[PDB]
C-alpha cells in the first residue's frame, strides 16, 4: 500500500472465514487503504485462518477485534473480487523499530 | 547383584583437582601465600649450579618422571612421580621477639612415598611441623639421590 510498498499479499483461494481487523488497524481498508465508504466485507483464505491463524488481522496481523471490510472505491473497481489479501511477508517495517 | 554403598566416590574428588591427564593429589591448605623472602633453589648435582628455579614466583610446582603431567622433566630414575612436595605457606608460628604474625616458611611433610625420604641423613615422618630453613641437605628421591638443592 501506502504504509508499505514492498509488502506482498497472499491472493489465495477465498473460503468461508470472514476477515477481521485489529484494534490498531480498525476502519482501514485492505486494498484502497481508506477510512470511508465500506461496501463489502473481507473474506480470508482457508490456510490463512487455521488454529492460531484464526481471528488475526489481515493488514496489521495482530489481535483482530472487529470484522474488516473493503472500500466501495475498490468494490466498484473490481479490486475486491481478487484473492485473499492476507499480509504474508513483512519487510522494511517493524524490524529496526524493535531494536529502539 | 545390587550392593549400593553410599560411600565417598572418586569422581567428586577428581573433579575438584583435575590435572591435564592424571589425578591431582597433595593439595595445599587455604593458608598458602606468596613468599617474599630471599631464597633461591640452588641445585648442585656435580658441584655446579647449572639451573636455577624460582619458588616464590610460582604457586604450584610438580616434578616427576612424566612429560605429560609435569612441565619440565627431571633426570632421576630412582625417584617416583609423587615422592616429595616442597611448598611454601605462612603457618602459625612465633617470631624471635615473641609477637605473633604471619611468617613465610617452607612446609616439610611426607606425602606417603613407597621408600620414604631422608634429609641430612635422617628420615622425617609426616604430619609433624619441622623447622625447615635454607641450605638444608635434602633428597628428591625415594631411596637415594646424587643431587642436593640449596
Amino acid at each position: 500500500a501506502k504504509h508499505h510498498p514492498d509488502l506482498i499479499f497472499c491472493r489465495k483461494q477465498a473460503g468461508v472465514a470472514i476477515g477481521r481487523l485489529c484494534e490498531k488497524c480498525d476502519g482501514k481498508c485492505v486494498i484502497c487503504d481508506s477510512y470511508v465508504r465500506p461496501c463489502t466485507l473481507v473474506r480470508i483464505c482457508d490456510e490463512c485462518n487455521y488454529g492460531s491463524y484464526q481471528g488475526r488481522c489481515v493488514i496489521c496481523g495482530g489481535p483482530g477485534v472487529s470484522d474488516a471490510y473493503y472500500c466501495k472505491e475498490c468494490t466498484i473497481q473490481e479490486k475486491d473480487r481478487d484473492g485473499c489479501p492476507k499480509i504474508v511477508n513483512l519487510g522494511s517495517s517493524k524490524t529496526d523499530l524493535f531494536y529502539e | 547383584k545390587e550392593k549400593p554403598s553410599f560411600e565417598l566416590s572418586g569422581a567428586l574428588l577428581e573433579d575438584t583437582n583435575t590435572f591435564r591427564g592424571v589425578v591431582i593429589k597433595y593439595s595445599e591448605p587455604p593458608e598458602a601465600r606468596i613468599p617474599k623472602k630471599r631464597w633461591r633453589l640452588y641445585p648442585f648435582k656435580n658441584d655446579e649450579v647449572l639451573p636455577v628455579m624460582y619458588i616464590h614466583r610460582q604457586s604450584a610446582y610438580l616434578l616427576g618422571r612424566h612429560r605429560r603431567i609435569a612441565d619440565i622433566p627431571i633426570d632421576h630414575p630412582s625417584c617416583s612421580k609423587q615422592h616429595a612436595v616442597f611448598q611454601y605457606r605462612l603457618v602459625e608460628y612465633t617470631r624471635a621477639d615473641g609477637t605473633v604474625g604471619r611468617r613465610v616458611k617452607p612446609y616439610i611433610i611426607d606425602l606417603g612415598s613407597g621408600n620414604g625420604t631422608f634429609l641430612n641423613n635422617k628420615r622425617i615422618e609426616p604430619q609433624r611441623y619441622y623447622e625447615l630453613k635454607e641450605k638444608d641437605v635434602l633428597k628428591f628421591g625415594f631411596s637415594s639421590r646424587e643431587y642436593v638443592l640449596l
Partner: protein
C-alpha cells in the same frame, strides 16, 4: 552451554562426504586410544598452513633461538625457578599508531581491527584486492551513523552483480561468525545477506552450505523475530538456489556426530520444503527414513517430518497420506528415539490435521494403543501426546471405546513429577474430556478431585506454558461439567498469598464466566466471589489487565445480581482512589471506567454524583498516566448518563478540559481528545462558540502527534465542531497552515478540509479552496490538490457536478510544475473517476485523460503507481474501448521501454473487463501461415 558449539564451526560433493568419514574415523581412533590407554592436540605444518590466510612467512631467525624455544618447555619450569626481575631508571625521553585512516571512517572497536586491519594502512591507488579493499563499506554498515548504514546498504545492493557473491561472503561470514557480535549488528548483516540474495541467483551455488552453517543457528533462538528472519532468508536461499543444490549440499550433515547440526538442519529442510513444496522433496525423505546404515539418520529425517508439520501446518493436508506412509515404519523400530520422535511427529501432523484425514492415520493406531500399555517414561507420554491430538479426529463410537481405555492410564499418570508428562497429560485431558461423547458425572467423580489436587500447585503457575495450558484445560472442564463446580472449588484461592497464582485463578474465573455465563452461580459462592475479587484487586504488585478485565467481566456477567455489593465496591474505589499515587490511581480509575454501565442501569444516582464531581476534581492531577485513566473514566461515564443529566454540567466540564491539550503525551492526549470528541459531537450546544473556536486554535498543533489514533480522533472532532459552527471560518483556519511541517500530521489538515467539506455541503466551500491554489507557495498548492483527492473520495456520487469546476484546475496542476503536482492531481483523477461512475459525465474525464496520458513514462515509484491507479479508475469510468484505443500502438513499438509500459497498462486493462474487450480488438489482416480475421462477426443475416 549447549549452543556455544557454534563457536567451533569452521567455514565450510564426494569429497565432502569423504571428509565426514575421515572425521568419524578419527573420532574412533582417539576415543579408542583412551579405552586402549581436545583443541590442544599438537598440529602439523600442513595443518598450520591451513589456518592462516595468504601471504605470511614461517622463516625463523638464528639456529640458537629455536633450541631456546625447544628448551623453553623444560625451561618454563627450569628458568621460572631461577633469578629474574625488572626495574626502571629515571630518565628524560616516536609514538606511531593508527585509527581508521579515511575521510571519516566511523570508529573501530578494539577487536574488530583483526577484520578491518587492511583498511587501516593508507597505501592507495596501486584489481580484486581493490574490490576487497573497497568492500570495507561493510564497516560502514556495521558501525556508524544510521544514514551511513542506509546509504552504504543501498550502495552495496547495487554492486551485488558487480562484486559477486564470493568476495562478499568471504568478507562477511567471518563477521557474522564473530564471537563478540551484537544483537543489532547480527540483524543488520542478516539484512545485507537478504538484500544481496534478492539479486544473486545462480551465483550462490558454491556458498549455500557455507551460508547455512552460520544461518541455521538463527532458527533455534530465544528471539522470535530472529527466527522469522532466519526462516525467511533460508527460504530465499533455497528458492534462490536449486533443489538439487540444496539436497546434494545438505546430506553430510544428517549423520554428523553432533545432534545440534542434525536438529537445526532438520528445521532447515522444513524451510526449504516450504519453499519448493512437499512433493518435490518427498522421494529424498522417503529414501532417508528407510536408510539401513544407522539410526541417527532416520531420527533426523523423522524430525524433519515433524518440523515440516509445524512449519507448513494446515497446508500439509494433500500429502498427509504419503507422509504417514513414510513415518509409520519407525514406530516399531528397535531403537527408542526413532520411536519417540516418530510418534511425536504423528502428533504434530494430527494437530495440523484439521478434523479430517483420520483414515490416513488409520494404520498407525493399532500399534500405538498397544504401546500405550507397555511403556515407561518419556516415550509413553509422547504416545499420549499423539493419541491425544488424534481422538478429536475419530468417530464418537470407536472413540467411545478407545477413549474409555485411555482414561484409565490418563488417571493413573497424573502424579508423575515429569513436567513434560504434566504438559502432555494436561492437553490430553483437554481433548479427551472436552469430547462431546463423554459423560459429565464420570468426569466429576473420577477426574476433578485428582485434577485440582495434583495439577493446582505453585510449581505450575510460576511457569509460563504450564500456566496457559492449565488455564485452557480448566476452562474446557468448566465448559462441560458446568460453572459452579470449577469456580466454587477455585474461589478460595483468590485469597492465596502469591500473585501469579491469584492472577491464574483470576483469569480462569474470567474466561469461565465469559463463556458459561453467571446465571449458574448460586448466592453464597457469589458472596465469596465478590469478596475474593475485591480482596485480590486490593493488592496489586504489578500493573496488568488480567485483574481488571477479570473484574469487569465478572460484574457485567453478574448483571444486576451485583447491586447489593456496590457500596462496598465504590467505597473501596474511592479509598483506593487515593492511597497509591502513581501506582493505583490509574487502576482504580480504569475500574470505574469499566464499571460505569453497571453503576448506571441499577439506577444509583448518588454514585453518579460521587464519581462525577470526585473525578471532576482530579483533572488537576499532574501525573499524566493517572490523568489519562481519569479522563477515560469520565468518558465511560458520559456514555451511560446523558448530556443534560451530567452531574458536572458540561458548562463546568468542557472549558476545564480545554487547557489540558498541551499535555502532548498520548496518555492524556488520547483520552482527552476522545472525550472532547464525544461531548463536541453529542450535545455541543451547552458551550458557547467562542470557547469552541479557541478549542480549534488549540487543536491545530495537536497534529504533531507521533500516534495515528490521536490524529484520528482529532480530525473527527474537528469535523464535529465544524458542524457546531459552520464551514467558512474553520476551513480558513485550516488554510492558515502552509504545510511547512512535513513531520507528524500535515496532510491531516487536508483530511480536515475534506471532512469539513462534507459536514456542511462542499457545494458551499469549493471556491475558497480553488482560489487558494493561486498562492505561489508550492507545497500548499499540492496540499489543496490532496484536499480535492480526499474530497472526492469522501463525497462519492455528489461529484457529478463539481467535476467541471475541478477540471481546468487539474489541467493546470496536471500540466507539470513539479512531479508531485502530476502525482497528486492524478490521484484526484482516480477518486473522481471511481466516484462519478455511470452518471454520464465521461466527456470531461476524457479531456482530462488527455493531459493524464503523457505522464505514463517515469521511474519514480510513487508517480508510476499513482498513474497506475489513475488509469485504472479511468478504465472503469470511461470504459475500456477508449483506453485500449490509447493503448494499441504502444504494444509493438520498437523500443523496449514503450513495450514494457504499454504492456503493463494493457495488462491492467486486460485482467478486469476481459469479457467486454471482445468487440474492440480491431481488424487485423491474415498472413500466410495464419488466419487473423475472425469471420464470425461478419456473418450477416
Amino acid at each position: 552451554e549447549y549452543k556455544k558449539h557454534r563457536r567451533t564451526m569452521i567455514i565450510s560433493a564426494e569429497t565432502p562426504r569423504t571428509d565426514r568419514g575421515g572425521d568419524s574415523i578419527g573420532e574412533t581412533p582417539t576415543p579408542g586410544a583412551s579405552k586402549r590407554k581436545e583443541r590442544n592436540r599438537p598440529l602439523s605444518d600442513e595443518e598450520l598452513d591451513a589456518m592462516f590466510p595468504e601471504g605470511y612467512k614461517v622463516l625463523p631467525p638464528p639456529a640458537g633461538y629455536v633450541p631456546i624455544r625447544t628448551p623453553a618447555r623444560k625451561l618454563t619450569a627450569t628458568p621460572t625457578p631461577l633469578g629474574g626481575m625488572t626495574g626502571f631508571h629515571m630518565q628524560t625521553e616516536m609514538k606511531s599508531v593508527n585509527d581508521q585512516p579515511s575521510g571519516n571512517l566511523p570508529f573501530l572497536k578494539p577487536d574488530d581491527i583483526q577484520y578491518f586491519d587492511k583498511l587501516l594502512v593508507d597505501v592507495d591507488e596501486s584489481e580484486e584486492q581493490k574490490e576487497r579493499k573497497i568492500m570495507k563499506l561493510l564497516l560502514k554498515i556495521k558501525n556508524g551513523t544510521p544514514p551511513m548504514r542506509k546509504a552504504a546498504l543501498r550502495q552495496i545492493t547495487d554492486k551485488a552483480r558487480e562484486f559477486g557473491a564470493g568476495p562478499l561472503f568471504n568478507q562477511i561470514l567471518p563477521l557474522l561468525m564473530s564471537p563478540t557480535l551484537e544483537d543489532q549488528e547480527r540483524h543488520l548483516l542478516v539484512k545485507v545477506i537478504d538484500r544481496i540474495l534478492y539479486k544473486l541467483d545462480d551465483l550462490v551455488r558454491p556458498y549455500v552450505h557455507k551460508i547455512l552453517v552460520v544461518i541455521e543457528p538463527l532458527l533455534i533462538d530465544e528471539d522470535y523475530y530472529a527466527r522469522v528472519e532466519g526462516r525467511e532468508i533460508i527460504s530465499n536461499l533455497a528458492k534462490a538456489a536449486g533443489l538439487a543444490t540444496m539436497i546434494s549440499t545438505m546430506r553430510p550433515d544428517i549423520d554428523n556426530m553432533d545432534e545440534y547440526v542434525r536438529n537445526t538442519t532438520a528445521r532447515a529442510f522444513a524451510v526449504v520444503a516450504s519453499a519448493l513444496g512437499i512433493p518435490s522433496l518427498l522421494p529424498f525423505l522417503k529414501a532417508v527414513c528407510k536408510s539401513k546404515k544407522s539410526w541417527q539418520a532416520r531420527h533426523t529425517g523423522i524430525k524433519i517430518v515433524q518440523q515440516i508439520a509445524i512449519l507448513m501446518g494446515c497446508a500439509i493436508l494433500p500429502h498427509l497420506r504419503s507422509l504417514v506412509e513414510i513415518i509409520e515404519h519407525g514406530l516399531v523400530d528397535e531403537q527408542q528415539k526413532v520411536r519417540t520422535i516418530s510418534a511425536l511427529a504423528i502428533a504434530a501432523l494430527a494437530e495440523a490435521a484439521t478434523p479430517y484425514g483420520i483414515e490416513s492415520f488409520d494404520s498407525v493406531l493399532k500399534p500405538l494403543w498397544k504401546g500405550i500399555r507397555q511403556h515407561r517414561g518419556k516415550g509413553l507420554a509422547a504416545f499420549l501426546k499423539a493419541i491425544g491430538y488424534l481422538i478429536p479426529l475419530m468417530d464418537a463410537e470407536y472413540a467411545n471405546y478407545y477413549t474409555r481405555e485411555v482414561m484409565l492410564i490418563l488417571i493413573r499418570e497424573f502424579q508423575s513429577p515429569d513436567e513434560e508428562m504434566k504438559k502432555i497429560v494436561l492437553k490430553v485431558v483437554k481433548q479427551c474430556c472436552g469430547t462431546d461423547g463423554v459423560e459429565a458425572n464420570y468426569i466429576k467423580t473420577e477426574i476433578l478431585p485428582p485434577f485440582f489436587k495434583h495439577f493446582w500447585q505453585h510449581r505450575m503457575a510460576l511457569d509460563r506454558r504450564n500456566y496457559r495450558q492449565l488455564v485452557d484445560t480448566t476452562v474446557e472442564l468448566a465448559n462441560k461439567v458446568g460453572a459452579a463446580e470449577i469456580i466454587s472449588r477455585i474461589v478460595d484461592d483468590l485469597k492465596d498469598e502469591a500473585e501469579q497464582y491469584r492472577k491464574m485463578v483470576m483469569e480462569t474465573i474470567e474466561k469461565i464466566m465469559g463463556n458459561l455465563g453467571a446465571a449458574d452461580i448460586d448466592h453464597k459462592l457469589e458472596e465469596q466471589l465478590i469478596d475474593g475479587i475485591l480482596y485480590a484487586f486490593q493488592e496489586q504488585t504489578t500493573e496488568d489487565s488480567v485483574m481488571l478485565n477479570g473484574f469487569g467481566t465478572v460484574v457485567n456477567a453478574l448483571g444486576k445480581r451485583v447491586k447489593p455489593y456496590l457500596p462496598q465496591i465504590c467505597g473501596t474505589v474511592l479509598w483506593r482512589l487515593n492511597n497509591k499515587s502513581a501506582k493505583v490511581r490509574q487502576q482504580a480509575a480504569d475500574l470505574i471506567s469499566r464499571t460505569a454501565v453497571v453503576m448506571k442501569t441499577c439506577q444509583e444516582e448518588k454514585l453518579m454524583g460521587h464519581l462525577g464531581v470526585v473525578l471532576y476534581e482530579y483533572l488537576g492531577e499532574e501525573y499524566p498516566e493517572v490523568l489519562g485513566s481519569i479522563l477515560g473514566a469520565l468518558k465511560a461515564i458520559v456514555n451511560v448518563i446523558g448530556m443534560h443529566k451530567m452531574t458536572p454540567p458540561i458548562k463546568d466540564l468542557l472549558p476545564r478540559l480545554t487547557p489540558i491539550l498541551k499535555n502532548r503525551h498520548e496518555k492524556v492526549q488520547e483520552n482527552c481528545i476522545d472525550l472532547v470528541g464525544r461531548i463536541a459531537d453529542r450535545g455541543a450546544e451547552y458551550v458557547s462558540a467562542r470557547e469552541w473556536m479557541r478549542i480549534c486554535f488549540e487543536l491545530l498543533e495537536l497534529l504533531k502527534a507521533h500516534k495515528k489514533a490521536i490524529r484520528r480522533a482529532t480530525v473527527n472532532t474537528f469535523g464535529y465542531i465544524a458542524k457546531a459552527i459552520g464551514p467558512h471560518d474553520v476551513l480558513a483556519t485550516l488554510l492558515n497552515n502552509l504545510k511547512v511541517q512535513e513531520r507528524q500530521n500535515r496532510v491531516c489538515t487536508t483530511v480536515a478540509i475534506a471532512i469539513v467539506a462534507e459536514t456542511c455541503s462542499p457545494f458551499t466551500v469549493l471556491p475558497a479552496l480553488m482560489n487558494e491554489y493561486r498562492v505561489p507557495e508550492l507545497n500548499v498548492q499540492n496540499g489543496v490538490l490532496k484536499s480535492l483527492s480526499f474530497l472526492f473520495e469522501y463525497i462519492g456520487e455528489m461529484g457529478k457536478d463539481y467535476i467541471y469546476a475541478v477540471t481546468p484546475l487539474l489541467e493546470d496542476a496536471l500540466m507539470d510544475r513539479d512531479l508531485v503536482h502530476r502525482q497528486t492531481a492524478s490521484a484526484v483523477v482516480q477518486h473522481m473517476s471511481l466516484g462519478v461512475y455511470g452518471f454520464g459525465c465521461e466527456d470531461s474525464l476524457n479531456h482530462l485523460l488527455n493531459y493524464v496520458w503523457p505522464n505514463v513514462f517515469e521511474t519514480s515509484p510513487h508517480v508510476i503507481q499513482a498513474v497506475m491507479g489513475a488509469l485504472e479508475g479511468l478504465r472503469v469510468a470511461i470504459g475500456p474501448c477508449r483506453m485500449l484505443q490509447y493503448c494499441l500502438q504502444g504494444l509493438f513499438h520498437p523500443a523496449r521501454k514503450v513495450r514494457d509500459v504499454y504492456w503493463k497498462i494493457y495488462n491492467s486493462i486486460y485482467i478486469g473487463s476481459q469479457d467486454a474487450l471482445i468487440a474492440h480488438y480491431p481488424r487485423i489482416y491474415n498472413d500466410d501461415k495464419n488466419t487473423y480475421i475472425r469471420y464470425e462477426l461478419d456473418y450477416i443475416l
